Ligand binder design. Structure first.
Ligand code: 8V8
Ligand code: 8V8
Ligand code: ZN
Length: 257
C-alpha cells in the first residue's frame, strides 16, 4: 500500500518500514564542495556489450526494463566496487514538471528525472540474497535534464503506451542500455539504500556527474503512464521520487578533481 500519494507517500513509509529512518538511507543531496576527491577510486568498468533485455513492466511504482541476469552478460565492476555486479533491471524516477523528479540532488538542484541501473553482487548468487547484504547491490544513477532528445531512449518511450497501467508488461528484447549513458563516467559514490520500500541498506551508490539530455516530448510520455491498474480511476505516474534523506555519518567520494 506504500506509494507516492498524499496518504501513502515517503512521509508514511517508516510506519511499515522502520529502516526509513536508518543510518544509511538514500537518496541524498550531493554537496559538490564537501565531496572529497579520492585518487584511489578506479575508473568504472561498464560492460554491457552482451546485455540481453527481456521485458518491460509497469509495476505500479515505475517501469522496469528487465535483463537476463542468469549469466555475467551485462556487468559493472571497478570504481568503488569489489567483485562483479550483474545488471538485473533499469528504471527511472521523474516529476510532474521539469523542475523536479530526480531522487539525488546536486547542491540542492533537482533534475527532471533519474535513471537507475540496478546490479547485484554475484558473490551472493541471486538478487534476493544480495539485498540482505551491505555490499549486495550497486546502482548506477544518471540524471536526466530536458533539452535535446536522447536517441537511445526512444525505443523505451515508444513502448510505454502498451504498459500504461500497473501489472502490464511487454516483450522488450534487443535493447542496448549503452545508449542511455553520458559521455563521461566521472562519478560520486557513497553507501546507501534502496530508495523505495523495503528501503534495505544494501546499495553502493554510483551517481554520474554528467547528466543525459532527453527531450520534453520524451519525458511527457513518461508522465502518461498510470500508477493504477486497468479499469481503475486514472492516477498519472508522476513524482515517483523519494526526497533527499539525512547524510548522517557518511562521506560522499568523487572520482574526479
Ligand atoms: C488510505 C490507506 N490505506 C492504507 C494505507 C497505507 C498503507 C501503508 C502505508 S506505508 N507505511 O507502507 O507507506 C501507507 C499508507 O493508506
Ligand atoms: C523488493 C525489491 N525488488 C527490487 C527492488 C528495488 C530495486 C531498486 C531500487 S532503487 N530505486 O533504489 O534503484 C528500489 C527497489 O525492491
Ligand atoms: Zn530507483
Amino acid at each position: 500500500h506504500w506509494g507516492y500519494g498524499k496518504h501513502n507517500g515517503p512521509e508514511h513509509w517508516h510506519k511499515d518500514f522502520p529502516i526509513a529512518k536508518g543510518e544509511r538511507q538514500s537518496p541524498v543531496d550531493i554537496d559538490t564542495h564537501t565531496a572529497k576527491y579520492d585518487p584511489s577510486l578506479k575508473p568504472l568498468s561498464v560492460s554491457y556489450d552482451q546485455a540481453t533485455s527481456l521485458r518491460i513492466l509497469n509495476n505500479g511504482h515505475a517501469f522496469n526494463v528487465e535483463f537476463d541476469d542468469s549469466q555475467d552478460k551485462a556487468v559493472l565492476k571497478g570504481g568503488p566496487l569489489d567483485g562483479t555486479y550483474r545488471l538485473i533491471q533499469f528504471h527511472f524516477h521523474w516529476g510532474s514538471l521539469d523542475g523536479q523528479g530526480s531522487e539525488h540532488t546536486v547542491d540542492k538542484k533537482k533534475y527532471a528525472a533519474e535513471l537507475h541501473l540496478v546490479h547485484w553482487n554475484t558473490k551472493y548468487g541471486d538478487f534476493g540474497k544480495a539485498v540482505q547484504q551491505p555490499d549486495g547491490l550497486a546502482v548506477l544513477g544518471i540524471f536526466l535534464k530536458v533539452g535535446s532528445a536522447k536517441p537511445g531512449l526512444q525505443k523505451v518511450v515508444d513502448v510505454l503506451d502498451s504498459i500504461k497501467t500497473k501489472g502490464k508488461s511487454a516483450d522488450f528484447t534487443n535493447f542496448d542500455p549503452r545508449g542511455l549513458l553520458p559521455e563521461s563516467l566521472d562519478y560520486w559514490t557513497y553507501p546507501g539504500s534502496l530508495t523505495t520500500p523495503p528501503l534495505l541498506e544494501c546499495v553502493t551508490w554510483i551517481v554520474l556527474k554528467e547528466p543525459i539530455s532527453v527531450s520534453s516530448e520524451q519525458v511527457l510520455k513518461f508522465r502518461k503512464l498510470n500508477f493504477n491498474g486497468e479499469g481503475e480511476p486514472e492516477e498519472l505516474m508522476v513524482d515517483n521520487w523519494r526526497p533527499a534523506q539525512p547524510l548522517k555519518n557518511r562521506q560522499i567520494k568523487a572520482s574526479f578533481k
